RNA sequence: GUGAAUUUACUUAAUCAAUGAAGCGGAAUUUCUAGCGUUAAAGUUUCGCGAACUGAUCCGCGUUGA
RNA sequence: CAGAUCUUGGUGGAAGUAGCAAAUAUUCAAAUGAGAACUUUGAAGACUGAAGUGGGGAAAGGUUCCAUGUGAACAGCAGUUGGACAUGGGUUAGUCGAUCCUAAGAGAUAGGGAAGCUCCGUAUGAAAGGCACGAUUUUUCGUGCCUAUCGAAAGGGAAUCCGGUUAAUAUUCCGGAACCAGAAGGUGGAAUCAACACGGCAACGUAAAUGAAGUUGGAGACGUCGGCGGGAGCCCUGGGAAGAGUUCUCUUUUCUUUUUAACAAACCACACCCUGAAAUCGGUUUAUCCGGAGCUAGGGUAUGGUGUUUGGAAGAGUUCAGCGGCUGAAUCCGGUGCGCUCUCGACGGCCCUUGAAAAUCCAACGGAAGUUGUUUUCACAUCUGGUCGUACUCAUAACCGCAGCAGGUCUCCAAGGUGAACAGCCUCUAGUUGAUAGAACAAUGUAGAUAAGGGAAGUCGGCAAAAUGGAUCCGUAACUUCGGGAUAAGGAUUGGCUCUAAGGGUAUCAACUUAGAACUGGUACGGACAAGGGGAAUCUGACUGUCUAAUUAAAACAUAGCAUUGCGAUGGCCAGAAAGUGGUGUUGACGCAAUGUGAUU
């Protein structure tokens, strides 16, 4: 809700930052085996459960 | 806001250092409102007489900032 | 006179039985009737709760400990007489 | 095979509802002034105690030792009015509402809120319309024989105190309730003891009386006193049974 | 419940104290 | 025009009291208002006291002393009739105990 | 457990009741009323709200009661 | 390895099949584009119809908000569009909450249990902490006086309003105007050498008007129902003025706009006072209360805004006419009420029910201290106000049901007509036009209608359907616990229009509400909507009420009543491994505990 605790907003802020696509220059590195973010989340599909 | 019914009270409050600015408001009924912005209140004097209006306006201290409608 | 027998217990309709409504009728009449104030003489004593009888008379405003449905009970009156008798012989 | 309703009444939801209570109705603590003389108090207000059939009386006394007022919560006797003076002590008069030792009152005195033992501030004859009768005295043993509202005879110390008069609010049980709703409201301020399901209407896992194709007990409903907590149902240790 | 309207009260007033006087 | 609560408190409660106003912009709006003040009760008879306004408890602290009191003994604590009964009862009982002292000293 | 002649008694061990653990045991020797009662003072003896001593007895001291 | 309804993964026939059918509904033009039933704009047609498909919040979600961009994938058709994908941006508080307080309740400490994990216990078997006086007292201190914490974004509570502003934030920013608390001294005034003010018969008033310890009082602080009266907004309404719709004809009209916040000042009558003494008793409410405990009457005091007048404040906002940001105008004067929502006042009813606490705040009693100096809850200026929450959804797509699921999920605002009505039906503001479409009308079906004559012959059973239905008037049985039954049953009446007849306020105004009288119409008439079928009886449970969520709503359970039993506290009943353990019990036989019957007769 609008009424949040500071602890909740911190966890939500980190969840937002982790819910981003991968930088493109990561994909060009030597020995790179990472192509797409395998930990992506959508707000309807998976819930954060905090 | 405060209403002042006495002209010399308006001058005295204008003389007081808390006075910051003054507004002269000319209404459609030929009644003027002399408003004085102080630290705490907007002091307003309703002068319905024309001749008392401009003698008061020239009575206001020169250092005070007087502003048109 | 609108009702012949039920009186105040006409508010209960046809329910709970005639005898139970009859016993309630005696007690409810006692419970709600106005009583003369023993302190100011006005007819101003009414029941606030079971055992508490308060007078609304101006200047008196006395509150009474009494019976559930009537201001004074027979047991209290009888024993008040005996206690008065006992104190006098002592 | 299940803990029965009687066993579960050890607290929790079966506790007393105590938010609206107006204080514990008690006599004055037995002090020097009330042991040797009398102390006078003023009845401030007669109040309704939720869950109690009798009214309470707020009585203000003076602290004999400090500049302060001590207000005591009494069980009101019939005839107590606001502004009345109530005297408590050995040398108190024999008037309705006064608190005197039972040894100082003549045989046949009607008393209420009587102390079982000297100093416990009132145990007997506390319910509405109930009272205790001073049967007699035994000065050599310092005891007083009294008649309790159940008709039993009891011996109390002559220094035990009792309020002269009958507890106010008498006749409260005469009126039929006419209603589950009014029984609901009466017990809503006392505890969770209502409504009551019969044991015969239960299942065998729930009660000794439960089970069977017809609603019956199957065994005698008069039970011993040595029986187990799950067994103490029906008529416990009944000497006589049935309506005379 | 007497005096069903203002006029009826008036006529009662007119007849009253006139039969007396 | 319909209105909304100005706060995030739904559920009209004894603290969520609102009032309808017309704003100078021709808008129907709520103004949230506080519970009404209370005239102090008398200490003996319990009736409201005469000569004192009806404010909230913290709101009384902004009045001067004379506005919260009546210029009489127990003014702002007891009503006039309560004070008069105090005065007469005090004097009469003092007279009684003087007479009893005279009677019992001999 | 302690005594006194199965019979009586005592309380310090334990048990129960009350409280703010206030007046317990000895001796000396406040009731016509819904009011207020505090922050000693007169008395005596030293030297002003400075003292003291009583006002307000002493003794035992087991907080009282069962 | 061919098997184990074997394991894991993969893939077939069914099969381009079942299906994509609830929530009335879309259509034309244009734009964009490779592509338009679906995107956007305009036009039209509709719906939600204020208990909304509207405007907000709480719980929950967490970035879904906003702008820009778009190959897929996702939106069970489509897609140029999207809560989807990508990139950035976005939430501003002394006053709104949290924080503070306490509630039920949690939970340390003292202690006591327990092999222990840990349990119990919450002012208890605790040495559980303070405050004040003094030439400094044997320069080694004397003399007095008296309870954690956590727990409420719906409870209690210090103080903010209007207009404007962004793509997205506003009681937070901007402009203007206030307010609260705290702190220090300053200025002006007030008291005081008759130390701590005066006036009023009084209720009490005044800009001030010292008051320690201690004690006490008040506020905070309180149910539910019913009408009555006041205010505000809304609704309604008579004129004026601005535009706009309509104009074959009619309509001095149809519609829109006519606005005024917190805050500041002044003003404003059930309780109380004064004189006076009342029966030929009077006063008086819708509601019968009041008076020798002082009525009526007369004169006073208090309470005092969501009232009036002004400041704020017309400069704002709104509406219109021009000009190339600016200039002109208008923004007016009234009515009304069994109306609606909220609120306030004074009352009435109800209870074997009597309907929180605490933090905070104020007052009194008391009388310590005390020419300058003392005081000063008085008017003024002066300074300050941290931390966290703040976007958005709150639902036929942002929550929970595996989902963009016909389910569920607390609450605030609430226009007009019809009508008793927040009914149904229709409309205004706002919102939406979303739910694969197109063409065809075969059988069967789902959902609605109707049917000659008969009228339950159907069927285990009138199951389903029909019939009845509003209001007014007349009439109403057995039986009964005398209250009911009862809308019993049975009859009649109902439109439109022109009229009168009454019912109120100060000659004149305001207001729907009933009685008739004609006249009139495909004997129509609650004309749509809405809206009981009834009667005679048996069995049974007295009644209202409760249960097998998801096959049983019942005669089952509960109930009031009746009865029995145990228990006078060292006690009954129940609980704990134990305990210096708890419940009943803030209890005391008109009580509690344990049962059995089940209103009355």
PDB file of C-alpha atoms in Angstrom, chain F:
ATOM      1  CA  UNK F   1     -20.581  17.473  -6.940  1.00  0.00           C
ATOM      2  CA  UNK F   2     -19.359  14.544  -4.865  1.00  0.00           C
ATOM      3  CA  UNK F   3     -16.566  14.793  -2.307  1.00  0.00           C
ATOM      4  CA  UNK F   4     -13.783  12.626  -0.918  1.00  0.00           C
ATOM      5  CA  UNK F   5     -12.001  12.375   2.398  1.00  0.00           C
ATOM      6  CA  UNK F   6      -9.029  14.725   2.603  1.00  0.00           C
ATOM      7  CA  UNK F   7      -7.072  12.154   4.648  1.00  0.00           C
ATOM      8  CA  UNK F   8      -6.167   8.524   4.063  1.00  0.00           C
ATOM      9  CA  UNK F   9      -8.641   7.598   6.810  1.00  0.00           C
ATOM     10  CA  UNK F  10     -11.835   6.050   5.430  1.00  0.00           C
ATOM     11  CA  UNK F  11     -14.509   4.812   7.804  1.00  0.00           C
ATOM     12  CA  UNK F  12     -16.286   7.823   9.296  1.00  0.00           C
ATOM     13  CA  UNK F  13     -15.293   7.591  12.957  1.00  0.00           C
ATOM     14  CA  UNK F  14     -15.553   9.923  15.933  1.00  0.00           C
ATOM     15  CA  UNK F  15     -12.237  11.453  14.810  1.00  0.00           C
ATOM     16  CA  UNK F  16     -12.984  11.522  11.052  1.00  0.00           C
ATOM     17  CA  UNK F  17     -15.503  14.360  11.249  1.00  0.00           C
ATOM     18  CA  UNK F  18     -16.027  16.319   8.031  1.00  0.00           C
ATOM     19  CA  UNK F  19     -17.898  19.420   6.894  1.00  0.00           C
ATOM     20  CA  UNK F  20     -19.060  20.634   3.478  1.00  0.00           C
ATOM     21  CA  UNK F  21     -17.727  23.960   2.187  1.00  0.00           C
ATOM     22  CA  UNK F  22     -17.948  25.922  -1.046  1.00  0.00           C
ATOM     23  CA  UNK F  23     -14.500  27.141  -1.992  1.00  0.00           C
ATOM     24  CA  UNK F  24     -13.869  30.465  -3.769  1.00  0.00           C
ATOM     25  CA  UNK F  25     -13.131  28.294  -6.821  1.00  0.00           C
ATOM     26  CA  UNK F  26     -16.696  26.900  -6.828  1.00  0.00           C
ATOM     27  CA  UNK F  27     -15.746  23.491  -5.425  1.00  0.00           C
ATOM     28  CA  UNK F  28     -17.609  21.368  -2.898  1.00  0.00           C
ATOM     29  CA  UNK F  29     -15.041  20.051  -0.434  1.00  0.00           C
ATOM     30  CA  UNK F  30     -14.661  18.487   2.983  1.00  0.00           C
ATOM     31  CA  UNK F  31     -13.065  20.308   5.877  1.00  0.00           C
ATOM     32  CA  UNK F  32     -12.031  17.929   8.642  1.00  0.00           C
ATOM     33  CA  UNK F  33     -13.174  19.262  12.005  1.00  0.00           C
ATOM     34  CA  UNK F  34     -12.474  18.253  15.584  1.00  0.00           C
ATOM     35  CA  UNK F  35     -14.869  16.994  18.228  1.00  0.00           C
ATOM     36  CA  UNK F  36     -16.815  19.642  20.109  1.00  0.00           C
ATOM     37  CA  UNK F  37     -15.422  21.013  23.341  1.00  0.00           C
ATOM     38  CA  UNK F  38     -16.920  20.403  26.759  1.00  0.00           C
ATOM     39  CA  UNK F  39     -17.908  22.868  29.459  1.00  0.00           C
ATOM     40  CA  UNK F  40     -16.287  21.684  32.724  1.00  0.00           C
ATOM     41  CA  UNK F  41     -18.619  19.787  35.039  1.00  0.00           C
ATOM     42  CA  UNK F  42     -19.263  20.759  38.642  1.00  0.00           C
ATOM     43  CA  UNK F  43     -17.373  18.780  41.256  1.00  0.00           C
ATOM     44  CA  UNK F  44     -20.300  18.236  43.637  1.00  0.00           C
ATOM     45  CA  UNK F  45     -23.537  18.321  41.622  1.00  0.00           C
ATOM     46  CA  UNK F  46     -21.982  17.378  38.276  1.00  0.00           C
ATOM     47  CA  UNK F  47     -23.796  20.072  36.268  1.00  0.00           C
ATOM     48  CA  UNK F  48     -21.915  22.213  33.714  1.00  0.00           C
ATOM     49  CA  UNK F  49     -20.263  25.317  35.128  1.00  0.00           C
ATOM     50  CA  UNK F  50     -21.529  28.771  34.192  1.00  0.00           C
ATOM     51  CA  UNK F  51     -19.205  31.380  32.709  1.00  0.00           C
ATOM     52  CA  UNK F  52     -16.642  29.035  31.121  1.00  0.00           C
ATOM     53  CA  UNK F  53     -16.474  28.082  27.407  1.00  0.00           C
ATOM     54  CA  UNK F  54     -16.608  24.617  25.819  1.00  0.00           C
ATOM     55  CA  UNK F  55     -13.080  23.775  24.657  1.00  0.00           C
ATOM     56  CA  UNK F  56     -10.985  20.661  24.253  1.00  0.00           C
ATOM     57  CA  UNK F  57      -8.603  19.898  27.150  1.00  0.00           C
ATOM     58  CA  UNK F  58      -5.396  21.080  25.463  1.00  0.00           C
ATOM     59  CA  UNK F  59      -7.351  24.010  23.999  1.00  0.00           C
ATOM     60  CA  UNK F  60      -8.008  25.368  27.513  1.00  0.00           C
ATOM     61  CA  UNK F  61      -4.304  26.185  27.924  1.00  0.00           C
ATOM     62  CA  UNK F  62      -4.592  29.149  25.531  1.00  0.00           C
ATOM     63  CA  UNK F  63      -7.158  31.029  27.630  1.00  0.00           C
ATOM     64  CA  UNK F  64      -6.272  33.556  30.293  1.00  0.00           C
ATOM     65  CA  UNK F  65      -6.955  32.719  33.926  1.00  0.00           C
ATOM     66  CA  UNK F  66     -10.202  34.689  34.236  1.00  0.00           C
ATOM     67  CA  UNK F  67     -11.729  32.940  31.219  1.00  0.00           C
ATOM     68  CA  UNK F  68     -11.254  29.528  32.870  1.00  0.00           C
ATOM     69  CA  UNK F  69     -12.473  30.552  36.344  1.00  0.00           C
ATOM     70  CA  UNK F  70     -15.269  32.382  38.143  1.00  0.00           C
ATOM     71  CA  UNK F  71     -14.400  35.054  40.715  1.00  0.00           C
ATOM     72  CA  UNK F  72     -15.739  33.170  43.733  1.00  0.00           C
ATOM     73  CA  UNK F  73     -14.561  30.500  46.149  1.00  0.00           C
ATOM     74  CA  UNK F  74     -14.117  27.256  44.177  1.00  0.00           C
ATOM     75  CA  UNK F  75     -14.767  29.268  41.009  1.00  0.00           C
ATOM     76  CA  UNK F  76     -14.270  26.972  38.048  1.00  0.00           C
ATOM     77  CA  UNK F  77     -14.655  23.928  40.323  1.00  0.00           C
ATOM     78  CA  UNK F  78     -18.107  24.180  41.942  1.00  0.00           C
ATOM     79  CA  UNK F  79     -21.386  25.780  40.948  1.00  0.00           C
ATOM     80  CA  UNK F  80     -22.790  28.751  42.848  1.00  0.00           C
ATOM     81  CA  UNK F  81     -25.414  26.674  44.660  1.00  0.00           C
ATOM     82  CA  UNK F  82     -22.832  24.013  45.525  1.00  0.00           C
ATOM     83  CA  UNK F  83     -20.543  26.666  47.029  1.00  0.00           C
ATOM     84  CA  UNK F  84     -23.432  28.168  49.005  1.00  0.00           C
ATOM     85  CA  UNK F  85     -24.314  24.752  50.434  1.00  0.00           C
ATOM     86  CA  UNK F  86     -20.648  24.251  51.344  1.00  0.00           C
ATOM     87  CA  UNK F  87     -20.584  27.599  53.161  1.00  0.00           C
ATOM     88  CA  UNK F  88     -23.820  27.113  55.110  1.00  0.00           C
ATOM     89  CA  UNK F  89     -23.081  23.488  56.012  1.00  0.00           C
ATOM     90  CA  UNK F  90     -19.578  24.353  57.218  1.00  0.00           C
ATOM     91  CA  UNK F  91     -20.804  27.181  59.448  1.00  0.00           C
ATOM     92  CA  UNK F  92     -23.780  25.268  60.864  1.00  0.00           C
ATOM     93  CA  UNK F  93     -21.803  22.143  61.774  1.00  0.00           C
ATOM     94  CA  UNK F  94     -19.103  24.297  63.383  1.00  0.00           C
ATOM     95  CA  UNK F  95     -21.885  25.888  65.435  1.00  0.00           C
ATOM     96  CA  UNK F  96     -23.181  22.417  66.333  1.00  0.00           C
ATOM     97  CA  UNK F  97     -19.790  21.154  67.528  1.00  0.00           C
ATOM     98  CA  UNK F  98     -19.340  24.336  69.572  1.00  0.00           C
ATOM     99  CA  UNK F  99     -22.663  23.678  71.323  1.00  0.00           C
ATOM    100  CA  UNK F 100     -21.798  20.015  71.911  1.00  0.00           C
ATOM    101  CA  UNK F 101     -18.398  21.040  73.284  1.00  0.00           C
ATOM    102  CA  UNK F 102     -20.128  23.418  75.704  1.00  0.00           C
ATOM    103  CA  UNK F 103     -22.554  20.685  76.777  1.00  0.00           C
ATOM    104  CA  UNK F 104     -19.920  17.977  77.269  1.00  0.00           C
ATOM    105  CA  UNK F 105     -17.226  20.114  78.923  1.00  0.00           C
ATOM    106  CA  UNK F 106     -19.383  20.429  82.055  1.00  0.00           C
TER     107      UNK F 106
END
